[PDB]
Design a protein around this nucleic acid. Structure first.
Ligand SMILES: OC[C@H]1O[C@H](O[C@H]2[C@H](O)[C@@H](O)[C@@H](O)O[C@@H]2CO)[C@H](O)[C@@H](O)[C@@H]1O
Ligand SMILES: OC[C@H]1O[C@H](O[C@H]2[C@H](O)[C@@H](O)[C@@H](O)O[C@@H]2CO)[C@H](O)[C@@H](O)[C@@H]1O
Lengths: 437, 437
DNA sequence: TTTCCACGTGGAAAA
DNA sequence: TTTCCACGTGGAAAA
């Protein structure tokens, strides 16, 4: 698709309040006449870098801030230049999340952190430690239920446990992240992933559990706990479950440390509606009424807008979210975050499935998250080099065929021409290529 | 995931009533103590052949019958052995849909056909032809609306128009489908796809419109019509839209001819719960109460079970469905269907985007749908031939480097060894490989 | 049907 | 860092 003047197209993930956001787009059209289409395609965080490089993609893209550094490095995002008056409306630290190489590259929307969600009727007193969950499961299994179910296919949901005892993504020192100092293979990370794997080995969780499976099981009252973010609360409200949101359990005495995301809205550098996108975001979405429309559809978490966050912070579910967020850390936005996430995803899935050990899975994850992606020019240099090597060889064999006068079959490969060249030069070549004088 | 004896795991597509089916599973657990888990993973029709080949995958898999023949050819499905008494409860033609090489390979559940779905308030009199849609759209655009929106990413939705004037998949003659006689490149197919591409060219449709975009636009009252199946009705019910279900419009005076699917349930050949699966399907799902539970969640269409279908056939939406189904054709279940579907999907997406012309898109689709998938042994044969070719060459150069005394640099490639061999034999080799005596 | 070389990226190796 | 051969499948070619 292509962005075209006079219309706005927005990409936001399918677990967010896209219906409420389209409601904001409808008000925008009422007052300005500009149509606003909100779409929630799959794997949008991966599709956007593929289409935007060529000029395609949506006008605005919503994702957590951790992806945006890589979009900016690739030149996919227009610089955001809000007036001071508007910057004053959002918490400074939310702006930090969307600053890359000194420039603001997106509008921050809301702060997200995972919390422990629990069924109060099945479990009036939720566990304070990861360690006690096995025994809690044994007890609930006798009653036909299970202790805990959460998405094991996305490393976002397992990272709090991996980081609890000392695992980290990229080390931060002297005011910067060290791209080559990755902490996914240290004792802390190994202990966290081992406990999770042992949960599966002892049949307290299933390695194939994903987002929809865990959400269905908690919202149907089959499991007593899940791990999820504020966007999930709306579907629980519609269910018959009496749920609480609280601090994640500790592991080895230390708090679980979720990676904290800032839902952010970037403007496609190829869009011809940059000013319209700015007006929509600053003056329609990032208002009390606009964020309310979105929040009422699927809760946003702690919104970047101070005026509305003052209301939302009264909700004890938000206070628990931010308690967890204080114990975690804001995600880096550096372009390498994509490589980190793929590597940890592979490690978690492979260790959960028994395909690899925890030590082997995390060792490979360490090297992969540190691996430098070859540039376009490097790939092209290698492609050309091998093109040239084949062309030189092909020309040699053409000349040997055309002038050798070797006693060759009507059809033969260049190996048979090589053999004849060898005999001419005084060599003997056996059937398997063994060659000697 | 591996099937475990004593529990049932089911895969069904996410647009079906998986919540109603899980209710059937819960009754089954209440009467037999066997846990039933219903899951709706993405791309399950592609995942099943990958996992089931090694004994993995679910106990039961739901999909339209078209996919089943390829599963059976690969040995992924247990043969279905209902007693004659049970078979008599389903319409004979539904059993034919799941018969492959003389054997029953799945239980038929329900007959699905696409219909034209329209908004009565915006469109009291739905169009009877495709030809009048452009004018109708221009009318509705003046009111800020559009005429028609349907999924353009899946060829199932566009096939009725492609088949209207003569396009076909595999020609049927003398009781068999001829897999070398494909009709995606004939005049009728071109005329149908040209009309669709012309709709996009004249801005009556957008090439990137997918399932959720079309469903959202119709269910929010922004487009007057959509093309979809019975599963979609419940979401329209919850919406404010006053809709009708009717015959698809004609093209060039001929009816649109949808490919008719039979939602079918196959039993994994690797399952240790084959008898439980048969009990669940025959005596819990394929009952009035069982199908009712699923149909209440998302309408199944015209169910294979005679007793319950006499109730459902009273519904004017089902009569419309079957009117369209009489105009279309039951899909083949032959293994070549997946290759047919991939080819047409690429052709539709490529012509709708302008990346290929209609003629060029359908010309490639014809050869692709007819292309014989090389066997494992053919691929292996090829792999070994090239492995051997490289190993013969490597042995010759090893012998040359070890015994030639060619005055070579410390590091050089085989081309330089070849060059030294050539001059030894009285040849001249230029820098680019030009070789002469 | 088989056969042959081309293709671009992997990863071992040397520095 | 660059270099070099291996890899398995594509598609042209001959039959
Ligand atoms: O699992 C890796 C994934 O984690 C984060 O994605 C979150 C996202 O921030 C949330 O808004 C919500 O949608 O859940 C997602 C996990 O499925 C990172 O933001 C993302 O880059 C990363 O791939
Ligand atoms: O688009 C190709 C696709 O068509 C059919 O899939 C249908 C399915 O039968 C319906 O039940 C519903 O889910 O819509 C699907 C299209 O998205 C074929 O059954 C399928 O094999 C084929 O790939």
């Amino acid at each position: 698709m292509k962005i075209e003047e006079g219309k706005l197209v927005i990409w936001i993930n399918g677990d967010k309040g896209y219906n409420g956001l389209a409601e904001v787009g409808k008000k925008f059209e009422k007052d300005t006449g500009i149509k606003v289409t909100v779409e929630h395609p799959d794997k949008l965080e991966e599709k956007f870098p593929q289409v935007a490089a060529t000029g395609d993609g949506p006008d605005i893209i919503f994702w957590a801030h951790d992806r945006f550094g890589g979009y900016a490095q690739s030149g996919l995002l227009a610089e955001i230049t809000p007036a001071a008056a508007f910057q004053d409306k959002l918490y400074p630290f939310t702006w930090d999340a969307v600053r890359y190489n000194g420039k603001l590259i997106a509008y921050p929307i809301a702060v997200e952190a995972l919390s422990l969600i629990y069924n109060k009727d099945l479990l009036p007193n939720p566990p304070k430690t990861w360690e006690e969950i096995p025994a809690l499961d044994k007890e609930l299994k006798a009653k036909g239920k299970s202790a805990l179910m959460f998405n094991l296919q996305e490393p976002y949901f397992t990272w709090p446990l991996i980081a609890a005892d000392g695992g980290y993504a990229f080390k931060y020192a002297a005011g910067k992240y060290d791209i080559k100092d990755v902490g996914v293979d240290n004792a802390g990370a190994k202990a966290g992933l081992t406990f999770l794997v042992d949960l599966i080995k002892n049949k307290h969780m299933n390695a194939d559990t994903d987002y929809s499976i865990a959400e269905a099981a908690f919202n149907k009252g089959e499991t007593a706990m899940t791990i999820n973010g504020p966007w999930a609360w709306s579907n629980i409200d519609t269910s018959a479950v009496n749920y609480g949101v609280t601090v994640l359990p500790t592991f080895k005495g230390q708090p679980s440390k979720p990676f904290v995301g800032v839902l952010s809205a970037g403007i496609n550098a190829a869009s011809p509606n940059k000013e319209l996108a700015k007006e929509f975001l600053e003056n329609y979405l990032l208002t009390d009424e606009g964020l309310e429309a979105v929040n009422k559809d699927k809760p946003l978490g702690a919104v970047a807008l101070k005026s509305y966050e003052e209301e939302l912070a009264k909700d004890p579910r938000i206070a628990a979210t931010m308690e967890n967020a204080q114990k975690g850390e804001i995600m880096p936005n550096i372009p390498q975050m994509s490589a980190f996430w793929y590597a940890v995803r592979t490690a978690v899935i492979n260790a959960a499935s028994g395909r690899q050990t925890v030590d082997a899975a995390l060792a490979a994850a360490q090297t992969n998250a540190a691996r430098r992606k070859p540039s376009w020019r490097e790939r092209e240099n290698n492609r050309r080099r091998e093109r040239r090597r084949r062309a030189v060889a092909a020309k040699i064999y053409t000349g040997l065929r055309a002038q050798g006068d070797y006693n060759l079959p009507k059809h033969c490969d260049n190996n048979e021409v090589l053999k004849a060249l060898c005999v001419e030069a005084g060599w003997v070549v056996e059937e398997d290529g063994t060659t000697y004088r």
